[PDB]
Amino acid sequence: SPEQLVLTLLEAEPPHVLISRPSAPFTEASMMMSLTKLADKELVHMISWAKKIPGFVELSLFDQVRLLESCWMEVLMMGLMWRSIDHPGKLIFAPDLVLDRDEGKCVEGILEIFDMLLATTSRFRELKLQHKEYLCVKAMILLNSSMYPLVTDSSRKLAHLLNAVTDALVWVIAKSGISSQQQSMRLANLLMLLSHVRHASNKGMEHLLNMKCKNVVPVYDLLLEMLNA
């Protein structure tokens, strides 16, 4: 139910992971080390976050697993863009890891990704994305992936959840008081951006799967696991 759902999402927000720039100047290696060490740690907290979304843990294990494998980079990115929204030309990875767009030139393949994240972040800024809309949109990213039946009432339980979160977003948007027509346009403007997020995610995933092939960076633990696929 929308007010309570939104409060839950609010209270579910994972902590900021703190990381710092290396002492020495960035190299392609040490930059990817920093961003993957960050991502790995944020993955750990993404799991706890997902478990706090009402109904998530009532889904079958395979369903929880597969939504998470499907959306994790999207969710890392969505949280990154939200942290960066008020800082044009920068990506706020952590309070002490603030990358200028040009620093992406340090790693082959990464500048484009930064540019996509930066443009999506500018689009959110232009729309004046509100904190409560960002909460619903992030939870929608988790809940809105293709499932196509696996071979293992969970899928019905998923639909009900995504419904509730979409309702919660429509309800958040109704608070602005704008015209019916403009409330529709805003919903569409927000949701159309889900594609950009998925598109950047895909480019991020492939970047990391390629780096992992080049041993351009060793990856560990949770991140390694998620990438192994």
């Binding site: 750990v44 799991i47 697993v65 494998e69 949770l222 998620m226």
Partner: peptide, 10 residues
């Protein structure tokens, strides 16, 4: 396979 994910979900 989701050797550690299973772990943290359960």
């Amino acid at each position: 396979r989701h050797k550690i994910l299973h772990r943290l979900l359960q």
